[model samples]
Target: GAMHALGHCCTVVTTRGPSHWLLLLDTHLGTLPGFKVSAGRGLPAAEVYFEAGPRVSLSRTDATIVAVYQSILFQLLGPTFPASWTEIGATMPHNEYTFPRFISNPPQFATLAFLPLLSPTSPLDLRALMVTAQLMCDAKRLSDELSASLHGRMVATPEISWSLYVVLGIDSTQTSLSYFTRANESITYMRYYATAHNIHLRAADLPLVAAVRLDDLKDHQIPAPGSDDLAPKLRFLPPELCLLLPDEFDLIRVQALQFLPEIAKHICDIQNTICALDKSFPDCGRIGGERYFAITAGLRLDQGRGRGLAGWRTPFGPFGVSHTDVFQRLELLGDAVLGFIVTARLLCLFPDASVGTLVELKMELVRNEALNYLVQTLGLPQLAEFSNNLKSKTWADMYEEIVGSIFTGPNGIYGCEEFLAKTLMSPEHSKTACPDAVTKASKRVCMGEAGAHEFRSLVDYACEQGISVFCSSRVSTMFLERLRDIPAEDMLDWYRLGIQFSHRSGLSGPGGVVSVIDIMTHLARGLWLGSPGFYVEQPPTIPVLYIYHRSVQCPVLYGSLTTGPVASKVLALYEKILAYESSGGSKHIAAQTVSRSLAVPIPSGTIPFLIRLLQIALTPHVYQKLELLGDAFLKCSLALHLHALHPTLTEGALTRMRQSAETNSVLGRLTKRFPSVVSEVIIESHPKIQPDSKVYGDTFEAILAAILLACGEEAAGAFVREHVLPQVVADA
Candidate 1:
């Protein structure tokens, strides 16, 4: 272990060993000249330099520090990093350099890294820092005619309780711990870390503790450094810090080169931003103007590397008393942070379990559920980065798309942006202020007010911030919240839940799973009385509710299995229960049915998309005609299956059978008619859909598939049964 010191404790003492160095030289910021570094209270500023080598100066400003680092790392050495540092997307272009067009635009924002100073500075020792931004925010504006649409939406979440903590020297040599958070309880170690460039510390090293801050907004007033009354709960460890990278100017350059470009693209609008170091790595060069291919050749240099882990340093106490040394303390911090989340979730699951029972369950939960939760809580998807050239090959597009969706714009940053804009920003505010407008506007409204005025103004601001006004200050005033007033019944398939619960009991089964093959058959024979309109996940507690009750009521009527002893007994019992208005049996049966089914949790999100699909599906058009062709497609499938299975049949016989199958099978016919049906649907859906419409039959199939897909398989089946089956049967 090593000693932990502040920026002040760091002084350019003497070089005890041979000078080894790495440098990231940038022409942008003047880091080739004179510079010194310092640390915390009581520690004096130390003159840091390259010992016995070329002397240099470093930039002191945070913004300037990030800028110079990025200028060289991202634009020069970026392509070599694992996972793509840039997104080169679809577009047929002649030249590669001009694609995306935004690499040259002004960057939107900057995020700085703070490293605690702990030792003497030298010119050869190195230190690293990160800088970045999202790239899709203004793609369209950059190139008016280009179509680089945002692939998804952005969600806005206010980081009200973010914190950063620093601790210094621990143990003999003295090491330190650093911690950071964006949420009150959700924190990670890798997200907050410091490194000593030329210095090395044993794994067992500990750090002295220092100050901790909560709710530290960039522009707002933060808690005073030593306010006893500010928060008595604040605990701390002794101030022990680590000198991650040496104070060598050249090594500082190397660290700067390590993590610049990728961070910049992320911090910027990456989807719209063309990386400057294109040719330096895989997906380099443009194929055409504003359109480029993401290069995917010769990547994967580090096919396998060290265990990929991100770390952070967190505080141990309000008084800052922590267990173990800094290195051990950091490791323990990770475990504690994760342990807290695990404990919280387990408690939520078992409100009544005995202590012993809870412990038993917690054991199982920690092994499996905890692991899964960590994978998510730590955001593993973000831990991996792509090589710049990985997207250059034809086979790499799918992989690139996967990475992009999980990490880049639209689904990722775009979703965040959109969510923030729609929920947090005022309607009147311009899009330019999408990020911090919520905080800015809220302050304006609450400057001064009375009990009622203050309450009302805050309420108004909350609504603008997407606080679900229904549950907030207006919980009792439900009459005023329209978002909550929408009909709950407008949701998706709840009937499916019942069907699921009843499936095991043969309620959803046609003739107890063996008898009922289709919903229509069940409906036609009085096997079921109502169509299930919902979804379910598990087996029904009592499955035969629908089948058994309905069969009993209509007994001695239908073909096969009529008047069976089981049916007789059920009918009599059901009648007896109903005679007394005893709803318990019926309710019990229904409950079982519901339990087996999957919940239509997605109904709220699915319905709107479904409705649009239905409009396209229900309309008289090509999709409708293709709906009629389901029988044909089925005929084809069955014929093919039969031909393969019936090998003994002669070739001629098989050929004839296949032809017959095509003529009689629903699936085969459907496939053939898909083209015509799709054309017809499009014509009808569109104003130009006429007998002589220019739309082709093939196009009609496409439209039909699109419409049917929108409605989903169940809805599509229902449409076929109600609209297509009867017409075809009658024609036959």
Candidate 2:
């Protein structure tokens, strides 16, 4: 009696990094399709492509965990470990994966659902999975002991805890189990070390068919249950079954079993020695270290996951919607995640540092040099699919992607904090290692065709308009380089637009000062694909005035400073000029306000999920994903509204009405309604999304998706009828 992994459950992952990859699961798996992504109401086209990427193989450690868990559950637990987690408890009838709690947390263990027929590991020898499993079980037990000690239940000697390195090693060379000194002053973990060749396998004989199966077992007389469903294209006999595969060891990263056991024999002595010494802490680093484990032997291939179907993976050809696009698109979000983390970390590390000083240090920390070094040091490139040379930016992006992945994953922000604390901010990443040429040259490469411009003219022009800014500090290089050939008209129009919002008094309140920083950045992002720039220099004067700057040479938009004051008539010159430039561009919405706006009412208790969508913002790809979903529904919603206003209007004119209200300009302007919220093709680094209709529209469209997904159809539509439709009529 047997079964397959029956239910089509489990997330189908492709590339794993950045928010896009992790948050992608939320699309079809959650409330998204219920509103923004279903049938005639909205275009469900995205569903067809969500699983398009060929299933990339699991990371080596993940593969090891899968194998190990399957073997242990099948053999050790026997009757309890069913063939399929999709169970039939007829009296209670549910698909809950039943298992003992000691095995692991239920959600954690649920991922290892088994399929005993064909190899889930593909070409890898299935039995090799057992060796890895044994290592994990011991580690898990010790981890429990360590937790027990923390709870004052029972003291687990440091020696037992140190052996954790040996087990974690079996899983990965790069990962480490770390701990702080009692004071949390220092974190320590030695590099994982083990030789797969040193392992020895103990042989055994049994009807191995239960965990795996065979063709001609005498049970054939009765009929092997699921064998009829076996892979005609897949056939591989276990080495243990053939009486050939014996004692597994020295395989990849698996721990040395017998040698490890010998250390255990002496562990009691070391445990006693530490207890006698002081008992304040175990003298683990000084005591005889965790020795080898042995008597191991074993080893296996995993196939790519794009098994059935054919969208981008199995058939046709690339509409250029390749995995590479996914990486690049997700790269925007990754860049934001890294900067946000690094900036917060800088603030955390230097509580009293000036804004200018902290920003400078942040630049150093998240700079291409630091990230590139961390990527090389952390050894993530081995796990990364696309291979590339170690240029600082690309290398930095890799590290950023890793950061984004962890932040978006189950561990999320805490995981991001721990990882950065251990690696990027540690002593190993000191400034002595910041390569001189690499650090300086990194800025040069991003420089465009623009030549140097002293900050004089920009400051002079600002003073002419009474727009005070700093003359002492250098202009931000990134903004200067991107100014390229964007017209003075565009500048005048935007500057005037900035003033218009101010004149309305509607722009007042706390955001008046910061809006310039955000809105000007928006202008540059939209105008020149987001010309990145922001620099603030604080003066020890009254109120401690801080100067602001966009990526362009023009520093300080509205810093209330006395650096270089402007003329009254300059506003008039620009006032006559206010009509000069036409408009364009979107941002972090607070969860509470977002809930208040939604009709379905995202309650305080249920707020965290919607908070994720809003946070999924701040970066473009997630912004872009929700943008598409929002865009699809907006057009449809408009179609219904305008047509309802007048079906008697000809279809030709209706298209005009729809297109006019549906215009990117309208959507872009709407973004000002929530003007709180990336590149390669570097936008994420310092995006200035002003006046760019696509970015604006996409961003505004994104907010709609967040609204609908959070509150539901009624609220999203209500938002449209109230806020969006009013604007549509204003345009008409």
Candidate 3:
């Protein structure tokens, strides 16, 4: 009823059509040599095999076993699918009989090619193998197209194996061949997928798989994609799959605990240096030596092969090959080092000096003028040689560099031999004379310490006393003491009043708080100075009526005094004095009585407070300027007052009276009158007093300034006539 299975296609000639079967006497199915194609049990077309006794029965397993062999044969003919198949196709038609392709049924060919691939016993999985082949085909097609688009000698290949390894997460050998194989598939698949999405691959992901895979990905290794864009998919492979070496994990800072001991001893040496400086100058106020200690430590850690200046060239390890950070640190720390060195040596020489005195000495040594001279004297222009632009480097820059280098070495103070050599003038002079000159210059610049007080409290006392008390005709111990006796709140009220006067008058300048403070302190100093030397006597001759100190010519202060708060009283008095004629009834007597009548009310409780406001009204600039005027006023007024009262007195007579007023003999006598008052007031600086004329002169002048500020010029003129004019008249 139905046709039986025909004998398997042992050989064929397709050109001769399906009817043709090229039969063979001997045929090989797999490795077995056998015979087939004869009529058997079912029908005339039923298959038979001679190897099985001429009537061989074919089981399903036996059929599969032969089919598997055929599939392997096809692969052996060609490495890739269609290529191997085509090679056989070309040669098969020409030599169909020789090759023994006897089977003509199309179904037989299908069974050999596809059926064996699915067999359970077969090594290749049919579905998986087909899928892999299709993927590889797609990747290759993309790669080929890309390669054609590129220029000459290009070899653009895909990473077929890499895609396999990525999908499978399998470990493989790291040989060059294996690496390139993975790259080819991996890179091609990525490129094709990226292209399909209409997104270009990032620069990092677009390179040849072989090139990209071999490059170190450690530094470039990143976590999940950083961007929210479509291209983030190509950012990086998963962390575990990334190609990285072991040593890469050790790169961060804390990972080097084992490496720290190498630099430990050098660090200890710096700590020792700090301790030494601190011990030597335990009470050195605000020396700022700590900054250099840190700088020295940093420099030591970065020190090079040899010692001294050349070692300074080596860079710090973490921030290699850059000297900028080192240079800036050295600049700041270098000044502090010089200040410490200067202070240490001064304290050693002057063991009994006050802190203020030592500070003055340090200022002279470190001031720009003195330091500039020191640089030249030492012939230290060699520092300029280190500069990239010599013209741009100033003497200051060189001095800073030299000082920095002196303390930057490993041996701290002991290493400053170069500095000591340059500083020491001669072997004999080094021990005694150089420091003496520095101290001498410092004292000279400070101008006998008239304005310098040891404690800030002394300045506060001056601020509280104000200018009214300072201007008092008498330096009464009771009166001066009363000025300080006011409650703390009232004292602050006085300070604020002075501040208001300064602010309202536009006298504060930019130094608002400091300016007002200085004014009050100056007023206090004047009172204190004059207090030491007060007495009264009458002269033989009448004195001239008016005189003015030279410093009032300053434009701003003069402008304020002329048109400001007390302008009507002070300006009118000044104008009238300038216009007045030295007339009959004794020019001195007329002036004296007029001055006496003009004396302003001296309110004991309010005197000190009024003095501060008066000083603010008279002058508009800072305390320094007022101090200059005050300093001159004491001596100059002494001269003018003598000149005024003793109109006929010779210059020689005038000189004698001036000397009495200028010398502290007057102050010593006055201060002696109230020893208790002197003791109650603090003199933290120079506890042992000297009979200094300049000191008394500066103090006396400050008091005169306070007088001008507290009362109008009219009262000041009268006070001069009543108190100062008589003293000069008696002396003459």
lDDT of each: 0.27, 0.32, 0.31
Root-mean-square deviation of candidate 2? 25.5
**What is the C-alpha local distance difference test score of candidate 1?**
0.27
**Which 10-residue span in candidate 3 carries the lowest summed lDDT?**
533-542
Ranking under TM-score, best-scoring first?
A: 2, 3, 1
The C-alpha stretches of model 3 lying farther than 4 A from their native spots are: 1-329, 336-393, 408-410, 423-732
Ranking by lDDT: 2, 3, 1
TM-score of 1: 0.17
Q: Give the per-residue Cα lDDT of candidate 1 at 109.
A: 28
Give the winner by TM-score: 1 or 3: 3
In the range 1-732, model 1's lDDT, one tens digit per residue, is 011111111113212222222322211111111122222121222222321223234434533543444443333232333322232112212122122222344342222222222233433222343312223122121112100121111111111111222211122222333343456753222222323132222332344233322112111222333332244333333222211212222322332223223122222322222344233322212221111112111121111112111001111211222211211222222222223222322232222233344345434433433334333332332322334442322222222222222212124322221221121111121111222543443333223211333323333443354342111122212212321222223111111222332343233441222111121121112211222111111111101122321212333221122444234433443344234332333323322232222122212233333333223333443233223222223222233344334433433453444444233233334423433433333444467534443333332232233233333333333333332333232111
Which candidate should be chosen as best, given TM-score against the real structure? 2
| lDDT of candidate 1 at residue 47, scale 0 to 100 | 26
TM-score of each: 0.17, 0.25, 0.21
C-alpha lDDT (0 to 100) for residue 728 of candidate 3: 44
